[PDB]
Design a binder for this molecule. Structure first.
Ligand code: NDP
Ligand code: NDP
Ligand code: OXL
Ligand code: OXL
Ligand code: CL
Ligand code: CL
Ligand code: NA
Ligand code: NA
Lengths: 317, 317
């Protein structure tokens, strides 16, 4: 039985299913200091969260890293590729769930539904009367999707049914769709009043949503981030909200989770979520299955199910 | 200049625009006791909320009641019709807004987004870690719309883009659509796991969502009510939630607003809103304009813009 390392916390379904083919090796944190000599025969890793290079490089027989999540920025895929290690992620099985969350977050941001529920639950409906009217609405908005991949397209399909205009920005256009392409992010931001962020966290997207993009978005502007916190210049966002440069924001992800700047907590026009876009039992069960099924496919057939683009590898044993 | 009575609270936009053609007469509550002899020449009423018959019958020259809202169950339309009084409502201008709110409420009910935001805002992400996974999801659900009118159809169009099956129950089928018709409410409830209520509050819908309907909905069942509180047997709903007969509920409307039963507040699988489905500035401005424009059309041309079905009347002066 190949030996699979699981560092730190992971969905119990992964742990439950690894014994179908594997011996499991557990360490308490993703930390190379916890690796003992008896673990040097480990052939695979299943991981949720960051995988530091020193931990990855502690295993000379490592063949595969199975990442829990579609984003795999916590894995140094360049180093994995240089070592001939395949990296797998969990695309597709979470696409519709994340797109649902994005829409919920957008509606909560615009219509203040969480605050309205608080008003009721605190007894204010009885004592004070109606919750104040929301200054914003989805009606009449124009939405720009930064990213139009698996998840961005699913978000766009939803938004088509809400009667809003849709535009998008990607490095390469996706022709065949009826959406307006913008070759620059700032150009799209100028044209739209609602910006949805759903790109990976890479060097090319680092602080792409900056002061210039937020200024272009404009005074009716609403920012929704369901991608990675790294993509938004978080200090610039706080400034834009403070000054009324933009009208609101809804964020599922942040620069340094679980820490959220105190200033972001003060704004009554901001909705905040603790990175919950895929966080249902059914979707996390599906993600768990795909982590395990990648490992099973690799060790049984030599072909993973969902290798990442950077590692189109086949097993050599 | 005709004199228009405004009893109790109304959107200030109504009050701002009435002077274009009318003299306004205000009373503090919708209460016949507040009517003075000098008010007996009043020719119209603009009202948000209930209009008791004794108040309506205090005005012998009354020609028109302009209701703020598409639902007009707070007006005794049978008595208005018997007196030859036209009744107007505010359809269409709120359709897309209410449909938006219904989807937001559904997503908040299923994915616990308001609770997840509370977890973050209370500091729990830091010490306790991730918000627990939501037991429910929209993924794989089958939705039954009780009502498929202006607003029900708008909700269905949205839901088509979320990849869920859609069925509906109305007294008469709407052929031409690709949705499955059910001739009974209980039959639809059997077949679906998600019931969205969007019918008017009438004698025929009074407690239609009862213990039998909730039992048929079943143990994965989610109830969303954005129609009228009268349509749901609220005591039966509390029992069903307590016993695990159904899995969750999201409610914008209640039997005796603003009072919500204490038991409903205790359930962690319930989202509650203070009747906010149309409650944005833009949509309430449009509703205000339609109340005033009905009154202006009536007194200038003798034809209202949006008379109700029960009063297809033309002005006689
Ligand atoms: N909040 C959460 O829980 C979740 C967050 N995520 C995040 O969402 C991301 C996207 O997921 P998914 O849709 O499956 O990924 P895809 O690879 O299918 O799509 C990525 C999109 O981003 C675009 N893109 C990438 N780099 C740039 C760039 N520099 N400038 C402009 N566009 C760029 C791509 O187009 P092109 O290549 O043409 O530029 C493509 O349209 C994940 O990497 C993850 O970080 C996903 C799931 C859960
Ligand atoms: N929470 C909120 O803020 C809002 C609530 N509302 C409520 O929503 C209601 C619906 O508005 P709207 O869609 O514009 O109205 P419509 O008149 O356009 O649609 C009403 C629908 O209900 C159906 N219906 C009526 N009685 C029954 C019955 N006994 N059994 C089955 N179906 C029935 C009708 O079909 P059929 O006649 O064939 O039965 C029709 O499909 C309003 O009356 C109002 O009370 C609306 C807006 C705001
Ligand atoms: O990429 C993911 O799936 C994530 O955000 O966890
Ligand atoms: O019927 C309406 O529009 C309402 O609920 O106010
Ligand atoms: Cl998980
Ligand atoms: Cl109002
Ligand atoms: Na703009
Ligand atoms: Na059922």
């Amino acid at each position: 039985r190949p030996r699979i390392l699981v560092p730190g916390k992971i969905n119990p379904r992964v742990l439950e299913r690894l014994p179908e083919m594997f011996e499991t090796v557990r360490i308490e944190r993703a930390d190379a200091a916890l690796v003992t000599a008896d673990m040097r025969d480990v052939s695979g890793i299943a991981v949720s969260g960051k995988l530091p290079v020193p931990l990855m490089d502690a295993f000379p027989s490592l063949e595969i890293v199975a990442n829990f999540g579609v984003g795999y920025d916590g894995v140094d895929v360049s180093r994995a590729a240089a070592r001939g290690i395949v990296v797998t992620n969990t695309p597709d099985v979470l696409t519709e769930e994340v797109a649902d969350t994005a829409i919920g977050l957008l509606l909560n941001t615009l219509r203040l539904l969480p605050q309205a529920e608080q008003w009721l639950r605190q007894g204010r409906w009885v004592r004070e009367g109606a919750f104040p009217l929301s200054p914003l609405s989805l009606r009449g908005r124009t939405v720009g999707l930064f990213g139009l991949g698996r998840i961005g397209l699913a978000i766009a399909r939803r938004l088509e049914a809400f009667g809003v205009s849709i535009a998008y920005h990607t490095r390469t256009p996706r022709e065949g769709l009826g959406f307006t392409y913008h070759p620059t992010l700032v150009g799209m931001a100028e044209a739209v009043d609602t910006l949805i962020v759903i790109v990976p966290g890479t060097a090319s997207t680092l602080k792409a949503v900056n002061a210039d993009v937020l200024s272009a978005l404009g005074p009716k502007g609403v920012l929704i981030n369901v991608g990675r916190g790294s993509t938004v210049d978080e200090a610039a966002l706080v400034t834009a909200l403070q000054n009324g440069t933009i009208a609101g924001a809804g964020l599922d992800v942040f620069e340094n989770e679980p820490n959220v700047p105190e200033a972001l907590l003060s704004f009554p026009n901001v909705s905040l979520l603790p990175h919950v876009a895929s966080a249902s039992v059914v979707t996390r069960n599906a993600m768990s299955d795909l982590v395990v099924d990648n490992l099973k496919a690799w060790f049984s057939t030599g072909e993973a199910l969902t290798p990442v683009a950077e590692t189109p590898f086949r097993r050599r044993a």
